[PDB]
Amino acid sequence: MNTNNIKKYAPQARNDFRDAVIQKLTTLGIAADKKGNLQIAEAETIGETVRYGQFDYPLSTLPRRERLVKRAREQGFEVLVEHCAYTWFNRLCAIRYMELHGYLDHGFRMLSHPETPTAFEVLDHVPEVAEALLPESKAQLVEMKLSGNQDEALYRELLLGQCHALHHAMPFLFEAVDDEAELLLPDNLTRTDSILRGLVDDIPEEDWEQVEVIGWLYQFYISEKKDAVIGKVVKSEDIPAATQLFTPNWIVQYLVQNSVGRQWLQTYPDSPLKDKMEYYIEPAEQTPEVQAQLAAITPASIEPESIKVLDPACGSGHILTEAYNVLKAIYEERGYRTRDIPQLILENNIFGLDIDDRAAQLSGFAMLMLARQDDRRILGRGVRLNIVSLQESKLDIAEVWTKLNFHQHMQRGSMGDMFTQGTALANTDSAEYKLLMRTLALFTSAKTLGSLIQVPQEDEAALKAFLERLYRLAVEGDIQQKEAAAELIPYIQQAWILAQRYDAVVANPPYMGGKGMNGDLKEFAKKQFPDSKSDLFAMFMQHAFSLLKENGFNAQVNMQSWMFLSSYEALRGWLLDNKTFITMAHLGARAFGQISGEVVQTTAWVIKNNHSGFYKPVFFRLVDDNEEHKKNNLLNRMNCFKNTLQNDFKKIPGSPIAYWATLAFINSFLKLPALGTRAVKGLDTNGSIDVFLRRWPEVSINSFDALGKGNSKWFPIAKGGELRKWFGNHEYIINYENDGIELRKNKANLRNKDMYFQEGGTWTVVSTTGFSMRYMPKGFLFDQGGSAVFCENNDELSIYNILACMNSKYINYSASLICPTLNFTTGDVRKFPVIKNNHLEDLAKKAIEISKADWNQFETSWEFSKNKLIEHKGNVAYSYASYCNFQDKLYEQLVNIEKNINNIIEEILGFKIETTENSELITLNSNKIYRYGQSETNDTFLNRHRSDTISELISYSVGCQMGRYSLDREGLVYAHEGNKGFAELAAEGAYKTFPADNDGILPLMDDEWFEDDVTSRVKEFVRTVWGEEHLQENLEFIAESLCLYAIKPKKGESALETIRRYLSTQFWKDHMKMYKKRPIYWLFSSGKEKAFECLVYLHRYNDATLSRMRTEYVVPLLARYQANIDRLNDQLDEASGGEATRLKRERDSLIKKFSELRSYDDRLRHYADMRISIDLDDGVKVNYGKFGDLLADVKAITGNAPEAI
């Protein structure tokens, strides 16, 4: 495996070389501070010796360092360090690869010795290698060999000579002479501490058998640094630092073989080439008109030396390798001389641009090695490549021109250009040359932009001629002319390369969103690409067509976001008006092996250049598989689709590419009215979420508009919610008094104000499972996340009809197809289809009635009437069975109604549709599946359901005891602040059947000392509701139900002990969970020990509550505890032995509780000193922290640890 050897060594070594570079800088008086300011020491010249502080060197090296000084100021310090580091790394890797494969003339290892670790073959053949490299001074080297010492110097000299020899064959990688990096070459190569030994014996040689390993370097040597430049804003320097990957071979072969091979086969269908190309795609059938039109432009014959392949982003160059393979196959088929084939291919068949010098060097080396593998006589001819990297333009305008002395050699020295000197074309004009100035002016910020700079085609041919002249000046001119030509070559070369027109383009554009783009890049994108400015690859794809000529091709692999999203929507339209698809493979996630994360969802597509809307493309579906399975399925031609016309994509609104979609569905989409613009967007508040939004049960009924009359301070407001059908989620209240004067002060957004308080349908803007719409009566306000629907004053579309249509399977499927991201903005909803009928109205009415009846059986709804179990007088089990039967009947009725609606819609449309996830889910609390989620098996939710029912019964009984509920009348009894009016209700006899506590304080202890014990009142309530004869069996049943799932059953106890334990242990958690951390019953606990705990109703509370509670409870409890302690102490002397022991220990705990109680009393004393009065409108979360530690779980509610007095 590659990662076993190449990885775990490539990244670390990247830093190591850099360190050596720093060392060299320290030896040359070159340094930078923390801020990066230049700290270059001043050279001292004494005795032809240069000194930089302490270090010294011979005078001959002085001028070279001066160039480095320029390198210090022309660019960044770290830039130069990294440049030298990767240059040396690439050179060493290339030398190792060449020596291992034995392509050298002499055929001797340099970095190691065969069958002898830590040695050198050249040391055994010094005269031969010296003659091969340096015949002129070999004898002196032999003297060094005669010396036996200075082995390091001899090795360094041999390495430098080998590099100089290798310069000629690869001018783009090795320098001939006067290389500054020679001074930067690390010393002590012969010593074991040198990194050369690690490079030699850190990777097995068996990995050096294929070119593939080279590519891995391009993905590893920077990978570590990628981790430091990922997820942040990216500058120009770091543009390649986080957008370098590797591509699997099969994808590249699919891209290449279906672009050039198809063009070749169209001209010559009878050729023995399709057999070799395994990934070629057989075109589908076409109409005779399409065939006639296509055959009208197919060329009769194409010269082999006329095909152009261009790569805007080469990197490793494996795409170029595949192209070279295909072109070699074509040339061999034609019948040229075999060994002549490679060089010709490298002449006018490959072109590559990149933005990193390292990538260009790697690509050149890879191509040269691939060519060498087959041709033996390569490297003996000066073959010049065309894989280059862009260069910035900062040079003297005319000084280089003056040094050119063009008129002296041929012509055009002073004023002669391609045009006249004073032509003044565009803005560059011609101080010395027209074309030169025009070309140079367009590369001012080339490093910032890249391959996106456009060049006019008309200037192509002339440029070519100009290039030739420079080629005649590098060898047949004076020193000044040669250096000027060398300086000016790259700019003209890259301009001419960009100025051509090509046939096939293959590339893998880098991925970078809006965040990565800097200000300059973003403003350039906005200026140049209005329709694709969202992301880089969109601009890349749009611009790639600018270089293709007629009958071109574009093959690319990129993210699938442009397929559906509306941001690229216009782009999609522009594709469907002038282009013509050929093929597309949707890979989705789980592709790009050796890469963590499934966010990468990519597709590979091949698109023609001309326009023909009646062609039939070929698609594929390879989403749900692993890499090997995807490759096998593509090999086996799995999941094909050839039943779609290109023009049909323009009928679906939004123009989304949906290949797997049927045809009848698309046709039926058109002949149906749309929803129109009835949908509106809800209002929004700036930052007042916690200022006006509250839960309904925590405010006064008078302050509630829905419950109260006359004055209005609060209003319900729907907002979000989970999946829910036809009714629910009315659990948020907002403050809108005096037409939102406070909101207008807050400057909150207000939209469609005049249409408020109107009945209609509402849907959730941001969902996670699907789409659903719910009814809403009048007197409501809708949030921005609660965009609503309102029918016109006089139109045939009723709200019930729309609600019936929306929740059908057809609408859900269409919505899923349109927006696969589960996001529902107003605009997309505005273009939904809608049907018209009459039975749908009554069916929707019945569904709404059933849903509302289901929702009106819980305390969380203000429309609560009464508990279900108290309507049956037979028995507890009988009432439970009746309740279960009622829920089952509701479920069955809803299921039948949904089935009938679906059947009616399907028969109206006339074609069946598929079923998907959550297509038949029932959103009722009666359904155990929806209420309790999904488990491994059914039948588990019986004991839990019974326990929850009994818990609800106990909670209702507690609420009745508190006075909130009364059995005399239905609905809410008293929910007003300050307990005011309680005496009037007592006089009215609202609690006639069941007395209500006068002080609104519920003690909770383990003894029956208090006459108002919760347990005793519960027993009285049960005996009143269900009589006295069957009291014991009912209590046993309730205890069993509680022991089922609520708490672990105890070994031996009666019903009363179980009830008391459940109340003292589990009740608070259940209440908090039910009311979602906004409790209405406040618990005051003396401590963790059950010394004293009481419950208080929030509404009935007032200032006098605290002192009255303290006086009426703590002092009598203190007296009782003191008397019990005195009695126990008196009896302790009477008792003896173990009988006394159990009497003593508990006593301690008791007095411990007593002590704790005293402490609580002290705390109470503090709050007995001050009088506290609060308001509901302040906020329960706000007010809960006003009592210090008198409450429990204060951090859970208030969100922070409470203070202490």
Numbering used by the authors: 1 to 1205
From the paper:
Anti-phage systems of the BREX (BacteRiophage EXclusion) superfamily rely on site-specific epigenetic DNA methylation to discriminate between the host and invading DNA. We demonstrate that in Type I BREX systems, defense and methylation require BREX site DNA binding by the BrxX (PglX) methyltransferase employing S-adenosyl methionine as a cofactor. We show that BrxX alone does not methylate DNA, and BREX activity requires an assembly of a supramolecular BrxBCXZ immune complex.
We have determined the apo, Ocr- and DNA-bound structures of E. coli BrxX. Around ~10% of BrxX particles did not bind Ocr in our sample, enabling us to determine the structure of apo BrxX by rigid-body fitting BrxX:DNA model in a 3.9 Å BrxXapo map. The TRD and MTDs of BrxX are connected by a flexible linker, and the apo-protein exists in an open conformation.
